[PDB]
Each structure stands twice: as structure tokens, then as C-alpha cells.
Amino acid sequence: EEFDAIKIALASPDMIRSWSFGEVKKPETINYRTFKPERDGLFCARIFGPVKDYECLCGKYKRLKHRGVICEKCGVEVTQTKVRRERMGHIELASPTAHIWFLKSLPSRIGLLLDMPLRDIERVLYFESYVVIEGGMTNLERQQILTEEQYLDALEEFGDEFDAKMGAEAIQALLKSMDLEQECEQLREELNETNSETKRKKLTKRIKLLEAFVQSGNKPEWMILTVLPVLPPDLRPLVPLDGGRFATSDLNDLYRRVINRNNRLKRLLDLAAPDIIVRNEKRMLQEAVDALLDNGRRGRAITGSNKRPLKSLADMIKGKQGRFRQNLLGKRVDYSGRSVITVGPYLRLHQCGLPKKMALELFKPFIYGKLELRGLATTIKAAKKMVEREEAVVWDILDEVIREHPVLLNRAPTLHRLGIQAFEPVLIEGKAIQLHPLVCAAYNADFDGDQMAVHVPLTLEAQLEARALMMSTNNILSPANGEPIIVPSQDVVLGLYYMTRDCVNAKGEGMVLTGPKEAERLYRSGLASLHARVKVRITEYEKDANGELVAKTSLKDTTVGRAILWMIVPKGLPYSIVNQALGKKAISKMLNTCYRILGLKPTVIFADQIMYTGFAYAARSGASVGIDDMVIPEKKHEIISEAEAEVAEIQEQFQSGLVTAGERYNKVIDIWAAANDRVSKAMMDNLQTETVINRDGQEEKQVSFNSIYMMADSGARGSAAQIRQLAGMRGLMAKPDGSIIETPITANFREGLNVLQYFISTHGARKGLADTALKTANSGYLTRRLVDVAQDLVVTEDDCGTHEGIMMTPVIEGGDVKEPLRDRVLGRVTAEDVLKPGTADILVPRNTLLHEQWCDLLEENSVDAVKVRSVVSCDTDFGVCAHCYGRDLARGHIINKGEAIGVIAAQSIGEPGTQLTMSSIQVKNKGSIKLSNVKSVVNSSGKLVITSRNTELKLIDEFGRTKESYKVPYGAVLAKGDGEQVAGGETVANWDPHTMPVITEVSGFVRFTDMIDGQTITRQTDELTGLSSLVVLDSAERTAGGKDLRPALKIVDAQGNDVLIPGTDMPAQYFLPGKAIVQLEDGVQISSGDTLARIPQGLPRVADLFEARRPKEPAILAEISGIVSFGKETKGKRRLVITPVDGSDPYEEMIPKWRQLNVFEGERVERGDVISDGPEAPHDILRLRGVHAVTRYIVNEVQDVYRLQGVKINDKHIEVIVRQMLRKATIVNAGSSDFLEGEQVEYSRVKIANRELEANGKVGATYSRDLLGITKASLATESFISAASFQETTRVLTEAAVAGKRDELRGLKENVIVGRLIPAGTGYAYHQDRMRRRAAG
């Protein structure tokens, strides 16, 4: 068994000879009649083997009497058959041919070896003419074509000392000639003398490459083919059909082609034919080879009479139709079934239907073995005939066998784990599968013609997994997020919401009950109202003492429904639980609380009884809909007459040649909107409490029985928008442009539609539908590419003994808290001693599991940031420590080693991603104000205005939480200064839409400077008012004469000097950008707060965030600190001369100057500071900042995008998938290894755990971190197997084999593809057995 690793190197022709069992010489396959093998063709039975076993063709020698005998009658060996799968032939060629993937693949592995270019050798081998096979005199070069009339000069010059003729043999001899060693050691010897610049690094490239081939062990001669194996017959079969028609694999075609051309070449070379035909035959042989190797890549594909091209070998490994994706990873199943589904309303949780027909079909082996055991069917003829005749015992024994015999259930698409579960059978003669209605949601399944599929645990590990793991009763929480999956579907909730209700109108007000018994006696007798708050007695309990119930009774004036319900409650809770009208939120929290304190089993029976009861009385509750449940409001004609008069006025306005259309058109839409929103009011007023039903009085009105508001209130179906679109206007409607129609839906469904309103709705319907049907692929790719990365994490030390790691702060932004820090802290270890807002009140000694005693202790405290020894910050090499991960969620305790995940992440993230694609600063409420890192100014008017783009407003509450978050234009006009307090509901900024003002706080003379007609600007009169100045065009419109120089109308005094900014020694003029149009002329004076210039006016991003593609257009954050200055002057984009304090200046990046900047031409930035208004590449963050800041940036952005959509995932996933991004360690120094070699950060830690230690102080090198993406990490892997599975298998196979790779089969897909166990799951015990063995010698 045991393995470490093994070596590989190229295919010897000796090896194909040894492997093969006989030359194939012919293309011939069979006879025309006697459909039987051909000697020395492709199906040579004497080579590959016979059909029967230990027998010769005559049948002399047989059955291991004559074991290693060859029947000399037919010369046929007495040998066995499973080798028929093995035994290959071979083929000896006329002339050498080469392997295309050593040739056409990127860096060639043969051209990169020689470093002599390609097209040279192409024409050497398209034989433009004679060609230097060997420039014996280096005067002549190899790979040098010599024409029939130029060759003679090489000839009569040297004659002897050159070989300049045709063929692949040129390259053969080349590879055989070149010697790698002494180049290597020489390049080293002169590396030591002067380890030069680019010169030496390419010396070094070669030196290490050379030695890599040396010590790796390689033989680039076998880059070139001389022997060609023959794939066995049954690897490329040829079979008949019923109608005599035959059927084949396309490979035989190419096999025949190659053999025929080769034999014809054997002919032409015996005749010394004119070698032009030998060239053509050589091109043809190499072509047929290369098409066996890769046909449709070279040129126009080869096709039959079909005109369709024919599949090669490579596609049988590659993409879909290869082994991997189609039928090695994903199979067709034995003993399965599937059919249409319907509801089981009277199921228990563990149950499922089984039409006994398919019960029998799948379980015939058990019932047969059992009919033999009893012996009624004495033989299998008897059992099969008895079971065709359907004995009565077949039924009782089918029940016997099926009793306690779990089975799986599968619906397409299997998004996450819970789409497939395992229930107990319930045998039925109903052709429809019955299904416990509550797991309609995990399946996303609703009964509109759906079919489920079914699978059979035969073995006992599978049976017991089905019952312990897939079971309906071990799965009660999403691991995406710890919510219950037991939601009331839509009916028991409607039921309960009806029961525990509290009217005023029906009857039976204020009498007394000793308890819910006479509540049921009354309500089942027909006396009380279920919905009537009537005095009763309760006797709840509580476990106040140490798990010790505490009895008590009391009275509570409560409804008949809550009363009657309360008995279901399992005597541990208070009555306030049931003392409201049971919203489904309450029901979530009910089974929550139930599970929490009780453990679980009550919550089980409890929920069963509640499903039971709500279904029962909801059928007794009655629910329907009527025409008058939607309205004919009394004010229907009057609204029409009013709208009639309004549009008549609009008509006459149009008649005038005034309001012309846009004002008119928008006016018309707005008035229609308001008119039928008033209709909506009329109607919802004319239903809900219109039932005036007196009772013992004058009159009283009460909620009428519409059923629409009720089914809208529980959460079953509907909501205010549904009810308006039935009632009021159906908002506006956008035609396919994305613009918005300005004459709406006026009517509704009851009143009656118009043809074109309908037709406009068809557009939005169709657009949204095509979005739905065409993004299952998008998640498809994102999920599956992420999973193919999937490796694991295993712990090794109790605590790494290491220090702090990550900070925890909650995720409240935009709205309320979205992850309590109470939860974020939950189960983790503290980085450190942590205090309370009563400070120096330590509560951990640097590390404690902070279970909810602590998280609640600290929810009690308003402490607002804590740190955690992170799994990242765990410094245990080749693993982590347990405290740093914190808690196992399933165990609910600090985690134990070995179990690990990450497709869990994939399901959690992808499964919801299916549909979930479809100026001002304010504070809202009281409290302190904590806004900073902004440049702003008290503008001319006396309130705050931004002058650094960074700020985004937040509406902070009195405790401190952000209630709202919104963005703010630079240079805006506020009515609030931050650090004030305001009543919410206020336009804090009344901004001008077009003007972006250019106010001059200074009072100095203006005069036209820096700015001249038709270079930096135009000067172009403001036509409407009529006065002007120098008029600053945008970026592209001005000519490039002065586009290289910033236009700045300048302020001066009577002296001409720089009117410095008031309070500082800084000059004050404005490098005017586009639209900055000054209206008053040269020499004019401006005032304080005076405008020189007036400036008028998805899931794809998910793909972008995950694929690590660069951000795109605009300028970015300060790359490096130190003074930064401007560069090359606008060849489209101007550059940025950075000048770091001690670092290096030369970096300069094209920036849109059209997109205005932040740091001026001689202002300093700190690194990682915004330069402009736009994003930055995350690679800038990893290369510039460390790891925590970058990963924080990414996870921030991505969960903002999701959280936007009403989304929730335990973000542990989004960080572990980023640990799996890339671990490429770009070395900083050299001395131990190369200077910037991509190495295992692991092995990096190893070397520094060896060399930097007293072996040296330091001889080696330090290292950096890297990114560049997930897919290339998939590629960039120890194994090539997991890499050579997915798309572009070809190039991966090339680069795999070229090293002679010999993967050690540890990763997931690695051991998978050979079907042997991998470290965990079922194989966990054996893997850790091997681990203890490795520890135990």
C-alpha cells in the first residue's frame, strides 16, 4: 500500500516495443463475410489476444494442461483475457515523426529548450529547400534553409563540413547532439565571476533549467517518436447492429490513414523516387500523426461525407464528453426510480410514500433471497414466476423487507445538501409519491407537475448514513446560517393565525375558565368564539431552580384559541409566548426557544402537533375569495369625470402650442398615478372594517372576512404591492430600453386591463424570465470552479500559544445589526484580555471560549470591539490550533480535528445566488458623532461642505449604530455640520443639480492667465445670459496643444501677486477643469465665496469580485507614500511622477484627468490613500498593504453586494475560500534559493526554520505573499490529476507529462479519479490510523 512518490521520464521506443505485443503492419480489420480478425492488421488476435480462454484456434491446447504452450498448428498461445484490455501492438515508421504537444503547445518544451524560433524550423520542415541539418561549420547554421542554387555555394565552399538537407532527422540529431551539463557548470563558473544583470538572470534561467533536466533525469531524445504503440482492439471497438449495419470509433480511420501512408512511403523509398513526393508523403504522415494527436486545431477540420468533423482521443478526456465531467465524476445508477410527486398531509416526519410496484422492482433480490429462505420459491425460476404472478406473500414480505429499510429521495437541481435526504418508506398503492409538506422548501418543490427521483442504500454503511446523516431528523439547520428549515409552508400558519385571534364582535365576552378543557368543550360544543379574549386560568411552570421545574397557576384574560392551544406547550415556558396572535416570526422563535432550553424531542412532537392542529382547524376555519373581496368603490364615476376634465385641459394646452409634450406628458402620468392611488385608498377603505356589526349596542365595526388581508398578514401569499396591483395602479412600466414609460397602468385586474398595458407587462415578464433561465450556468461555473480548488485543513496543536489575530466588529451598516458581535464572538477564543466600557475590567486571561454567557455578558456591556487569535493568526506550521477556529457548530463546542469543509461554502453561497440577481450629510437620531478622515470646509454660507471625496454620510442613532448610510458629492452644499444633532426627516442639503460651484473665498482681481484660446480651452460665450471668460472644455474636446497643461484663471491683487488662501502661505487660483466657465471678463475682481467658474452638469460584479480581475477605468489610491507629482502630459491620459521619501520615484500611471484627482501636483499622499474618485486593484492592497487589510477589503465589498440582496452567509466561508486563492511566495532576497521563486510559503517557513536558525544567522532569503486568482491555483497545484480533469485538459496534460509528473494521490480529486479513499469522511478512521502509525514508527 504505502507510498511516497515515484519518477517519470519520456517514452522510450524500447518501452513501446516492450509494452507492445507485435507490430501492426496493415490497416485491414476483418473479412467481408467471415467477420473475423486479420493477421497483422489493427485487430491482430495473434498479438492482442484471442476471444476465448486457454485455447488455440484449432483448440488443441487447453485449460492449463498446456499453460505456456503455443499451438504450433496455428501458432497461438494458450493465455488469458483481461490482458486484452492491456495488450497493445506497436508500429515502426519509415521516418521519424514528432509529438505535437511538445511542439504546438505554449512554451514549446522543445523550442524553448533550443530557444531557436519556430517558423525557421517550419520552413526547414516544409522544406523551402535544402536546409542545414547540421551547420558543421558554424559558419553555416543549423535550421538554415539553403536553396538549390545557394546550397551549391555551401557545397563547393565546404562540401564536407555542413549537412544541409531535409527532414525531421535534423531536429532528432539536434536534440541528440546538444549537451546540457557543461553549459550549466560554465554559466555557473562565470556567474560567480560577475553575476550580471538580465544577461545573468537568463544565464541562470538556463543553468537551473539545464540542471533540472540533469538531476530530474530526462531524455529529450524521446521528445521524438520512432515507435508508435497500437491501442488494443476493445479500446476502439467495431461492432454490428441488428440490421447488419456496423459501428465504430473514429480512431480506426486515422490508424488506417497512418499505416497506409507509411506503407506507401516504404514503397517510395524502395524506388528512390523523386524525393518531392517523399516530402509530400512526409508532410502527409506527420499530418495524419498530428490529427491522431490533434485534428481540429491545425487548419480546416477533417470531416466525413457528413461534413461533421470526427472526435479525437483528446476529447475523450476533455471538457464534457471526456471521462471526467460526464461519466467518471457523475454516473448512471443501478436500482433507482423517479416519478411525479404529491402531498402527504398525514405523514410523520420520517415517512415517505412508496408505490409498492417500484418497492418490489428495486427490492427483488431481498424478496427472492427471502422466498428461498422460506423455500416457497425453491428456485429462482420459481421465485421469478411466483413474483410475476404476485403472490399474497410477496406483499407481506415486501413490507417485511421494507420495514426499517431507508431509501433516498432526489429532485433536480441538487443545489445544496438538503435537496437529497433519506426517509422511512410508507408503502402505498397510490401512484404519486407523498411528501411531508415541510420539506417542500429544502427541495424548493411545489406540486405543479414535478417528479422526484429515488435511490437505494444497499450496503450497511450506506443504510446507516442514510439513517444517521442524510436523515430527515439529523438535519434541522442550514450550515450557511443557523436558521431553522421547518418553516410553516403557507397553511398551518394561516390556521394558527386564525385561531389565537382576538376579535370583539362574535360573542362570549368575559366569562371565566378554569382552563382550556372547557375551552375545548365550549368551542367543540359550539358556544364560545375561538377568537374572544375571555378570562381563564393557567398553570404554567418554570425551571428557575437548577433544572428544577417550578409550578404555579394564575388567570389570564386570553383568547379561547391561545387557551386551547396552550396545553400543547411542554410545561417549561411562560404564557407570554402564546399571548400574541402568532406571527410566523414567533413560530421560528417558538421552535428555536423550544430546541434551545429543552433539547429537542419536545420541539419535535410539539411541531408535529402544531402542524396537525393548524391543518385540522384551518380546514375547519374556512378560507376562500370572492369578487367583492376586491372592490367596486363608490367614487368610480367621479374620479373618471375628474380625470376627464384634467385630460381635456391637457388637450387644450397641447392645442395652444405651449406645454408641448414632455411637461404635459409627465404631468399626465403623475395625475393618473395620484388619481388611482386615491382609488386604491377608496377601495381598501371600502373593505377592511366596513362590516359594522352591532353587538349589545348601537354599532361597531370590525375586521371583515375578506381573507386577502389575512393571507397577506401571516406570510403565506401576497403583500401590499400584490394587493395594490389588484387594487391600485401597477406602478410605472419600463419598456425593454430600461427607460420608464410616462403614461401608466391606470386600471387593475378587477376593473379591467388595456391591451397595451398587458403587452407592456409581457416585455418585463420575458426579460426577467430570460434572466431566470440563463443564470443557473453562472452559479454553475462559479460554484464548480471554486469546488475544484477544494482542499482541507487539519489541526495539530491544542493551542499554538500564539498571540492575537483578527478583530471582531459587527456588520450593521446601511441598516441595523446584521451579525451581533455577540454572535461573532461566539465560540471563538479571545486574542487577549478584554475589558468593559467600565474599563480595566478584564474578563478573559488572554484566551477563553466565549460562549453566550460571555457574549451575553458582553452584550450587556456596550463593549464594541474585541480581538481573536485567528486561524490565520494561528502560527502553528502546516496547520492551525483549535482555539483559533473556536467552536464546532454541530458539536456546539470547541472543534475536534479532521472534519473540514468548503463545498459547504459553495452550496451556501451559490444556492441563494440563483434568484437573488432578480450633496447631503444627515444624522437621524440622537447621540455622539464620530466622522473623521475628511477634508471639508465651512463654505461661504457657513455650513459644512466636503472637499475630500472620501466621506459617506451615516445616520447614527443615540446608542451609536448606523441607521442609514448614503454617499455625498464632493464640494456639495450642506445645511448641517457634522457633530450637530438634528431631527430626522430633513433635507440636510438643498443642492443645485447642475452647478458644482467654484467659490473663491478670496477677494482679488481676476485676469486671464495660464489659459489661451484653443490650447487649454476654448473661449466660448455663455450665450443665454451674455458675458463670459476663458471657457474650459472637457478632456477630449480641446486640442492637444494645451491639453498637456492645466488651465487656471488666476486671482491677483493690484500688484499681480498670488492672493494666498486666507490663513496660510498657499497661493489661491483654480486649475479650472471642464465646464468651469467663468462668466465675467479679464481684469474683473472676485469676492469671498465667489464663483469664478460655474460648472453645469449585479451578479456580473459577483463574477468580478470572485475571479480577481483588475478594476477597470478610473484612477486609484496612492500606490506609494512620499511626495507625488505629475508626469507625461496627456497622450490621452496624463501620468503621475511619484517621488517616494526614500523609495523609488519612476512609477507613473496613466490617469483620466477627465476624472478629477485629489492629490495636487506637489501635494503629498500617504500610500493607500485615494488619488481620485474611483476604486483600486486589490492586488495593489496585497502588494502594498498586508494580508488582513486586503482580505478585509474583499470580504467587505462582496458581502455588501450580497447583503444588498437580502442575503446571509456565515462569512467564515468567504475567508476560507480566499485562503484557497493562492499561496505563492515570491522570495524577496536570495542566497538559499532563487531570488523571487514561487515556493510553498510552507517550505519557506521550513527553510527559515532551518537556515536562519543557528545554522546561519541568515544565508537565505525572505519572502512575500501573492494572489492572481483561484483558477490558476487550481492549475497551480502539486497534483496534475485534479488539474488535468477540467477544461483545457490538453495544455494541462502537456505541461504535466513534460515534467514526467507522478502525483502522490492525496488530494480529493486525485484519489477520487482512481477510486481510492482520501483523508476524511468514511476514510477518516483509516487515514488517522495511518497518522498514528506514522507517529508510531
**Binding-site ranges for other proteins (CB under 8 A):** 29, 32, 62-63, 65, 239, 241, 243-248, 250, 274, 276, 280, 283-284, 298-300, 304-306, 308, 310-311, 379-382, 384
Closer to other proteins at the Cβ: 303 or 928? 303
Of the residues 60, 279, 543, 1019, which one makes contact with Zn ion according to CB under 5 A: 60
**Which of these, 604, 623, 794, lies nearest to 712 by C-alpha position?**
623
Is 71 a known ligand-binding residue?
yes
Site string for Zn ion, 72-101 (x = CB under 5 A): -xx---------------------------
What's the min distance (Å) between Cβ of 448 and Mg ion?
A: 4
Query: What is the closest distance, in whole angstroms, from the C-beta atom of residue 413 to Mg ion in the complex?
Result: 12
Residue 1264 identity (one-letter amino acid): S
**Alpha carbon 453 to chain centroid, angstroms:** 27
Decide if residue 874 touches Zn ion (CB under 5 A).
yes
Q: How far is the CB of 62 from other proteins (least distance, A)?
A: 6
Which one of Zn ion, other proteins, Mg ion, none interacts with residue 1121, CB within 5 to 8 A by kind? none
Query: Is 448 one of the binding residues for Mg ion (CB under 5 A)?
Result: yes
User: Is 58 within any annotated ligand binding site?
Assistant: yes
Whether 1082 has a binding-site annotation, put simply, is: no
CB of 341 to Mg ion, least distance (A): 9
440 is in an annotated binding site: no
Terminal Cα distance for the chain, rounded? 16
Instruction: Provide the residue type at 850 as one letter.
Output: L
Q: Which of 818, 894, 923, 783 is nearest to 1202 (CA)?
A: 818
Which of the listed partners (other proteins, Mg ion, Zn ion, none) does 450 bind, with a CB threshold of 5 to 8 Å by partner kind? Mg ion
Complete edge-to-edge strand list for the sheet that includes strand 1136-1139: 1136-1139, 1122-1126, 1164-1165
Q: Which is nearer to Mg ion, 152 or 412 (CB)?
A: 412
Of all residues in this chain, which one has the CB nearest to Zn ion in the complex? 874
Residue 446 binds which of Zn ion, Mg ion, other proteins, none (CB < 5-8 A, kind-dependent) = Mg ion
- Which one-letter DSSP state was computed for residue 985? S
Question: Is 448 labelled a binding residue?
Answer: yes
If one asks whether residue 71 binds Zn ion (CB under 5 A), the answer comes out as yes
Q: How far apart are CA 105 and CA 101, in angstroms?
A: 5
Give CA–CA dist 872/229, Å, rounded: 51
HSE at residue 105, side-chain half, CA atoms within 13 A, is 22
Taking the complex as a whole, the smallest distance from the CB of residue 445 to Mg ion amounts, in Å, to 6
Query: Mapping DSSP to helix (H, G, I), strand (E, B) and coil, where does residue 158 land?
Result: coil
Residue 28: CB minimum distance to other proteins, A: 9
Per the rule left: phi > 0, alpha: psi between -120 and 50, beta: everything else, 981 is beta
CB 136 within 8 A of CB 144: no
- Smallest distance, other proteins to C-beta of residue 357, A: 20
Q: Is 816 annotated as a binding residue?
A: no
- 3-state helix, strand and coil shares in percent for the chain, rounded to the nearest 5: 35, 15, 50
Q: Which residues contact 9 (CB under 8 A, 6 or more apart)?
A: 217, 218, 219, 222, 1300
Within 13 Å, how many C-alpha atoms sit on residue 751's CB side? 23
Task: Pick the closer one to Zn ion by CB: 66 or 543.
Answer: 66
Give Cα 814 to chain centroid, integer Å.
24
Nearer to other proteins, 281 or 1180 (CB): 281
Nearer to Zn ion, 157 or 1242 (CB): 1242
CB of 304 to other proteins, least distance (A): 7
874 is in an annotated binding site: yes
Distance CA(439)–CA(569), nearest Å, equals 24
Out of Mg ion, other proteins, Zn ion, none, which partner does residue 81 contact, by CB within 5 to 8 A per kind?
none
Which residue, 60 or 104, has its beta carbon nearer to Zn ion? Answer: 60
Q: What CA–CA distances, in Å, run from 1228 to 496, 875, 1263?
A: 68, 21, 5
Which of Zn ion, Mg ion, other proteins, none has residue 884 at its interface (CB below 5 to 8 Å by kind)? Zn ion
Work out what residue 539 binds among other proteins, Zn ion, Mg ion, none; the CB cut-off runs from 5 to 8 Å by kind.
Answer: none
Q: Please report whether residue 446 would count as binding Mg ion according to CB under 5 A.
A: yes
* Residue number with CB closer to other proteins (239 or 1314): 239
What minimum distance in Å lies between the beta carbon of 415 and Mg ion? 14
Q: How many residues does the chain have?
A: 1337
Would you say 450 is a known binding-site residue? yes
Q: Please list every residue in the chain followed by a chain break, i.e. its C lies more than 2.5 Å from the next written N.
A: 918, 1097
CB closer to other proteins out of 62 and 784: 62
The reply on whether position 727 binds Zn ion by CB under 5 A is no
Which of the choices Mg ion, other proteins, Zn ion, none does residue 56 contact, using the CB cut-off of 5 to 8 A by kind? Zn ion
The answer to whether 558 touches 530, Cβ cutoff 8 Å, is no
Q: Does 806 bind Zn ion (CB under 5 A)?
A: no
- Nearest residue (CB) to Mg ion, 413 versus 801: 413
Q: Could you say which DSSP state residue 1253 is in?
A: I
What is each CA distance from 157 to 146, 150, 151, 764, in whole angstroms? 13, 11, 10, 82
* Least gap, CB of 584 to other proteins (angstroms): 44
Query: What are the φ/ψ torsions at residue 454 (nearest 5 degrees)?
Result: -140, 145
**Binding partner selected for residue 308 from Mg ion, Zn ion, other proteins, none, CB under the kind-specific 5 to 8 Å limit:** other proteins
The three cell numbers of residue 174 are: 539536434
Please give the distance of CA 204 from its chain centroid, rounded to a whole number: 40
Question: From the list Mg ion, Zn ion, other proteins, none, which binds 299 (C-beta under 5 to 8 Å, kind-based)?
Answer: other proteins
* Lookup result for grid cell 527559515: 1248
Which of these segments, 43-51, 444-452, 760-768, 1057-1065, binds Mg ion (CB under 5 A)?
A: 444-452
Neighbour count for residue 537 (Cβ, 10 Å): 14
Q: Which of 1330, 1186, 233, 31 has the alpha carbon at shortest distance from 794?
A: 1330
Q: b/e string for 139-159 if b means 16 or more Cβ within 10 A?
A: ebebbbbbeeeebeebeeeee
Rounded Cα distance, 1297 and 218, in Å:
12
Figure out which of the listed residues 881, 975, 1017, 1217 binds Zn ion, where binding follows CB under 5 A: 881
Amino acid identity at 571: K
The 450-469 contact track toward Mg ion, x by CB under 5 A, reads x-------------------
Residue 875 in contact with Mg ion, rule: CB under 5 A:
no
Q: Which is nearer to Mg ion, 446 or 864 (CB)?
A: 446
Instruction: Work out whether 872 is an interface residue with Zn ion (CB under 5 A).
Output: no
What residue type is assigned to position 278 of the chain? V
Stretch that binds Zn ion, among 60-68, 192-200, 434-442, 500-508 (CB under 5 A): 60-68
> Is residue 672 a contact partner of residue 757, using CB atoms and an 8 Å limit?
no
CB of 609 to Zn ion, least distance (A): 46
Contact between 829 and Zn ion by CB under 5 A: the answer reads no
Query: Applying CB under 5 A, which of residues 10, 30, 57, 1012 lies at the interface with Zn ion?
Result: 57
Residue 283 vs 517, nearer CB to other proteins: 283
How far apart CA 811 and CA 817 sit, in angstroms, is: 6
Question: Would the annotation count 44 as a binding residue?
Answer: no
| CB contact burial 1104-1142 (16+ within 10 A = b; e otherwise) | bbbebeeeeeebbbbbbbbebbbbeebeebbbbebbeee
**Residue 800 binds Zn ion, judged by CB under 5 A:** yes
Integer angstrom CA distances of residue 578 from 511, 611, 1281: 20, 16, 59
Q: Are strands 1164-1165 and 1122-1126 parallel, antiparallel or unpaired?
A: antiparallel
Contact between 440 and 446 (Cβ < 8 Å): yes
The site partner of 809 among Mg ion, Zn ion, other proteins, none (C-beta below 5 to 8 Å per kind) is: none
- Residue 5 touches which of Zn ion, other proteins, Mg ion, none (CB < 5 to 8 A by kind)? none
Residues paired with residue 94 on neighbouring β-strands, in sequence order? none
The type of residue at 119 is: R
245 binds, among other proteins, Zn ion, Mg ion, none (CB under 5 to 8 A by kind): other proteins
Instruction: Enumerate the known binding-site residues for Zn(2+).
Output: 56, 58, 71, 74, 800, 874, 881, 884
Instruction: Enumerate the known binding-site residues for Mg(2+).
Output: 446, 448, 450
Residues in contact with Zn ion by the rule CB under 5 A: 56-58, 60, 71, 73-74, 800, 874, 881, 884
Residues in contact with Mg ion by the rule CB under 5 A: 446, 448, 450
